[PDB]
Amino acid sequence: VFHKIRNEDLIFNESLGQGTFTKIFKGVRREVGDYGQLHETEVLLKVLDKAHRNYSESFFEAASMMSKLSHKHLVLNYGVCFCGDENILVQEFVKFGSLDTYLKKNKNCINILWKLEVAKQLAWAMHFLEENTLIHGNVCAKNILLIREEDRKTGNPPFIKLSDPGISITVLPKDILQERIPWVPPECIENPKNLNLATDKWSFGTTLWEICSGGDKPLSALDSQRKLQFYEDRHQLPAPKAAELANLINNCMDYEPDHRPSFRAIIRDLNSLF
Template identity: 30%
Template sequence: MEASLQTILQQFEHLKIQLDEITSATNNFDDETNCIGYGGFGKVYKGEVSLAERRSMAAIKRLDRRHGQGEAEFLKEITMLSRYKHENLISLLGFCYQGDEAILVYEHASRGSLDRHLNSPHLTWSQRIKICLGAAKGLRHLHDPKETHQRLIHCDVKGGNILLDDHWNAKLADFGFSIMGPANDLHSTVINLAAGTLGYIDPLYHLTNTLTKESDVYSFGVVLFEVLFGRLCYTHSNGHVQQILVPTWKKCYEEKKLKDIVFKDPTIQPLEQSALEIFSDIAYLCLKESRDARPKMAEVVTELESALESQELLKSLELAANEEFKGEWNKHRSYYEEITMSAENPVNYRSEVELMRLMFKGVLLKGGKTWLSLNKKGEQCEMISIAECLDPKFKCESTSR
């Protein structure tokens, strides 16, 4: 393995960082002052390293072979992160393979992993949804290559592998278990005898030992419910998992009891009703037993964007609302409800805020010839097709030509 690994690593020569640089950056791997975490690969340290004539704070992951991972996972991280570039994927800055050391150097996500912030009173619901949306976009990039790269199945999607930067942007990380599949394969089925984390693993994996991109979707659904309820998907004691909460969460959704256990904190704005429904609906679909019934990550992204729009609209209305707007809205609400039903493409809404969002976006009426919308002052804005303004005789002459 040693000789073949060295041969493969030659193509990544530009990413090599000397061991002296890393030991200096980590104070010789000082656990007390520089260690910021640990996982299956080993401990993670923070430290400044020199890159392209500048110094950057980095996360430095040092392989500990006693945890069961080794050169195969080390090489996979390098090859995967060199090939897959996206704003919602953690960036590989370099590596060191020298003596007995195998070290990976990443961009530093200063706020750590998502699982540490599930019950934080400092994160608003808008921020929580944005984090989920960012992670979903990163996973969509891996699943839907659009001929730019091979499809990648992450195989270990969980809150601990979603990192957060200074601005709470989500970065999907840890590709040691990831597996590539052909871009034109609808399901990208693979066989793997050891992958994932208890509580997040696709239940069908235990029955078939097969993983697909839909397995990642299941794991992401678990993360969505963790964010919704503000806690991990399992209980544990003495370092051992005692109970997986996912079945209980699914039952709460089916019995329409989500409001009883959704994360709440008096210091943050509550989750808007339509945002709750959109968010929980897509989370539940991700957890469907049938892989065919689970949504694609592109669909998950779309739904999370809608949930964020609803939550952001509630925020903007509360900040900017005035008595004049409220009066106008209440006066015409029944009219707006009728409009949504008579639109060119009738639309459904789940709350008053979502009805407002629909009206702010606008709806097509009269066979698609009229566009009606509201501005933030509550004023109606109507755009009419030029065909409606033309003289009927002129229209006939134009049509006959």
């Protein structure tokens, strides 16, 4: 159960746009920290309308279940504000934000070894979730958060976290799932009840395609109906220009869910590209 944060300890400063049925803000939380020190902590606030009850329950149950598994590559949620007509997730503010925007802002001037390190870190997060049999269900580059940039002097790589899962595709409207092709796997387009650990292997492949493509969105030129035809004709994504990960992408985006490799196997594969 999330720690309850009082509305009077939350300051909303900047509107940052929308997620899927969420409104996003930057703000500050006033809190008591270690040694009793009084802090004003930068937070990322995700607002859900309590009138969308099924969506809010799904969102917060997913955030809560993943925050029960503390891990270096999983986002920190500080708690929640049951804030009148809205329920608000109070999350850590990750300094460099979403990875797809970061890669665009850096004009894909990122070397393959950087991409390999981020891919390995996500794979280790996903292996942890797999070992815990916890489905994330919305793995994508917008949900990879860059804590720190590479530091060439120390040799330290970039460091990422995986963000909260959001509303489950088992409750979302079908038209939203189709818009989310090719992150949502073919079996879930056929029936959202096919959500499974295998779902995250597919979406991991799509996310590696994003990373290798400098934050482009696959199939962006296709409307929903052509995205369904993509899957009907069982096509595979084009190799990214950073084609070093094309084989892994295709191996994870296997139309047969039971053939998608374990994250332990994915990590070994990534290591062998060094």
